[PDB]
Amino acid sequence: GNTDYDWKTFEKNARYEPGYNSSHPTIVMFWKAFHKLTLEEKKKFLVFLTGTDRLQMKDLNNMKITFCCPESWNERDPIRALTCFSVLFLPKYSTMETVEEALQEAINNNRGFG
């Protein structure tokens, strides 16, 4: 469902914590899920990661995400995010499926976010 939105620039310009890179297994498998989903689904992702809904192209083309896995991350930890500097809490999932499903979980509103 993509429609005139430069997503390459987004995955390319994103931030990682010191010692993490897009080449890390967990992060490449994360991007894989972000590329197969539709426009509606990725909008939900951004809407919970950022503090602005239905973000404009001017926002998206400079928008970044900061990947983070807490010192005590867990394989079953839910994917959360903070609107401070767009940090996405991504645990070190052992499989490519668990990250694909977790991507859906959070966009589908993982509940208890009150």
Range of the domain at 65: 7-107
Active site residue ranges: 84
Q: Is 114 within the bounds of a domain?
A: no
Count other Cβ atoms within 10 Å, centred on residue 29: 17
Count other Cβ atoms within 10 Å, centred on residue 65: 23
Residue corresponding to tokens 């807490």: 70
Q: Is 61 within the bounds of a domain?
A: yes
C-alpha to C-alpha distance for 5 and 16, rounded to whole angstroms: 22
Strand blocks (E) in the chain: 15-16, 66-68, 80-82, 87-89
Q: Is 12 within the bounds of a domain?
A: yes
- Token pair of 3, please? 């429609």
Q: Is 20 within the bounds of a domain?
A: yes
Q: Is 113 within the bounds of a domain?
A: no
Positive or negative: CA dihedral 16, 18, 24, 25: negative
Exposure pattern of 74-110 as b/e (b: 16+ CB <10 Å)?
A: eeebebebeeeebbbbbbebeeeebbbebbeebbeee
Among 15, 38, 37, smallest CA distance to 88 is for 15
Residue 86: CATH number of its domain: 3.30.2410.10
Side chain identity at residue 90, one-letter code = L
C-alpha to C-alpha distance for 27 and 114, rounded to whole angstroms: 27
Count of structural domains, the chain: 1
Question: What phi, psi does 98 have (nearest 5°)?
Answer: -60, -40
